[PDB]
């Protein structure tokens, strides 16, 4: 008999920090004899550089694909009226120098020798611009901007379209539009308070960053390993021991360093594969339930999904799924059909329910009694083949017109 508006957060990483490493610098550095001895091992350094460049350009490609789903940059209208609804939390704040919404500011504040970190091609400002354009497109065009040219549409009309797509009639929308807007605003405030109060909400990107930092720290600390030598430094071995055994010791040290580097490269490769899978999942969610209505159940949100608002996150994407949840159920008596004048009547889209003495037809998601008539029901055969039918009269809408 009632319903509530609930908002949930789903976090999916899309990319990590790009890493570039030089083999000859990381292994030994500024030793000419080490560089000469490293040339006889083949093209291991070239293969590692090729793999690192490939995973870097793959990261850039999926980062561009997950965000730049449209080629038109839309802007919000100056009038911030949407039939009583409030969207100040998701829309960017013009007072902020970075043109970032306070939600994005909260997410940014809540996230804290050969190897180097290459800056991403897609930085924060145009990612925020892309998210703002997507929000404008989904707030002013619905799903029309994602399927072609943008078409202007009022927000209550889009809400009615989404309700009819999910299986709810448009009667309950205009009767409780203010109630729906107030519930949505209260849910937005509650989820904002929960996000500001819970430090573990953004834990996925936190553990991704922690894993990347731990891998970098392990790669750095592996350089201080003796690996069967007298010391982890090479100049002491070069200037202390005789070259016949010093060459063997340096060979063992550099092959241990190469094995450690190969292990780090393999770990980075499998982590990049996992991040690519997560980014593919995020892109499928983007295509399904952001720029349109998704009929899937419990795919990108618990309950009857309505829409989601993508939010910019550091090295990730955060969705604000808004769902439809029924509430305040009531007990009623149902019948498979209605037998009238020896004929069986079946509902076109409703269900026959009774409160104890009268029969009515109601929707499958909301309670709305109506008189059983010929417009909403169809006749197919007599009323004895079915089991469990009851007897109830059917009112003819057209009968009183010619009765007088």
């Amino acid at each position: 008999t009632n319903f509530t508006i609930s908002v949930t957060t789903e976090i999916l990483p899309v990319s990590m920090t790009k890493t570039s490493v030089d083999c000859t610098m990381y292994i030994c550095g500024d030793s000419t004899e080490c560089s000469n001895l490293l040339l006889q091992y083949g093209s291991f350094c070239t293969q590692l550089k090729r793999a690192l460049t490939g995973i870097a350009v793959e990261q850039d490609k999926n980062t561009q694909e997950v965000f730049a789903q449209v080629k038109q940059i839309y802007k919000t209208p100056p009038i911030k009226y949407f039939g009583g609804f409030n969207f100040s939390q998701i829309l960017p704040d013009p007072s902020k120098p970075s043109k970032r919404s306070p939600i994005e500011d909260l997410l940014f504040n809540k996230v804290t020798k050969g190897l180097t970190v290459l800056p991403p091609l897609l930085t924060d400002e145009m990612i925020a611009q892309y998210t703002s354009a997507l929000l404008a497109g989904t707030i002013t065009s619905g799903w029309t901007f994602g399927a072609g040219p943008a078409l202007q549409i009022p927000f209550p009309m889009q809400m009615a379209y989404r309700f009819n797509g999910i299986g709810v009639t448009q009667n309950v929308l205009y009767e409780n539009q203010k109630l729906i807007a107030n519930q949505f605003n209260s849910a937005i405030g509650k989820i904002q308070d929960s996000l500001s109060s819970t430090p573990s909400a953004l834990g996925k990107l936190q553990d991704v960053v922690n894993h990347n930092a731990q891998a970098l720290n392990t790669l750095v600390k592996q350089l201080s390993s003796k690996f069967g030598a007298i010391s982890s430094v090479l100049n002491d071995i070069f200037s202390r021991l005789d070259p016949p055994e010093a060459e063997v010791q340096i060979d063992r040290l550099i092959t241990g360093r190469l094995q450690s580097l190969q292990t780090y490269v393999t770990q980075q490769l499998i982590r990049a594969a996992e991040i690519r899978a997560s980014a593919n999942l995020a892109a499928t969610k983007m295509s399904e339930c952001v720029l349109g209505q998704s009929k899937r159940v419990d795919f990108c949100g618990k309950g009857y999904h309505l829409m989601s608002f993508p939010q910019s996150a550091p090295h990730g994407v955060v969705f604000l799924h808004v769902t439809y949840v029924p509430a305040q159920e009531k007990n009623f008596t149902t019948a498979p059909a209605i037998c009238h004048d020896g004929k069986a009547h079946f509902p076109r889209e409703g269900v026959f329910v009774s409160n104890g003495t009268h029969w009515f037809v109601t929707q499958r998601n909301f309670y709305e009694p109506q008189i059983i008539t010929t417009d909403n029901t169809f006749v197919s055969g007599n009323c004895d083949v079915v089991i469990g039918i009851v007897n109830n009269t059917v009112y003819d809408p057209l009968q009183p017109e010619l009765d007088s």
Partner: protein
Amino acid sequence: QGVNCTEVNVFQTRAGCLIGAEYVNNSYECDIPIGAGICASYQSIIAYTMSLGAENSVAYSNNSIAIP
């Protein structure tokens, strides 16, 4: 990458200074990505800010539609 050329057509970016390519205030479609939001292309070689797309501000109204 990350090395300042002041202690070695110069345009200093976040990734580093670019040598041989001039900076253009006008923005076009990106061809060769570089990083940090600035990429170069060949037209001579020039460097410019990446273009997200054509700006299109739809006129949102309380009682207006654009039916196809």
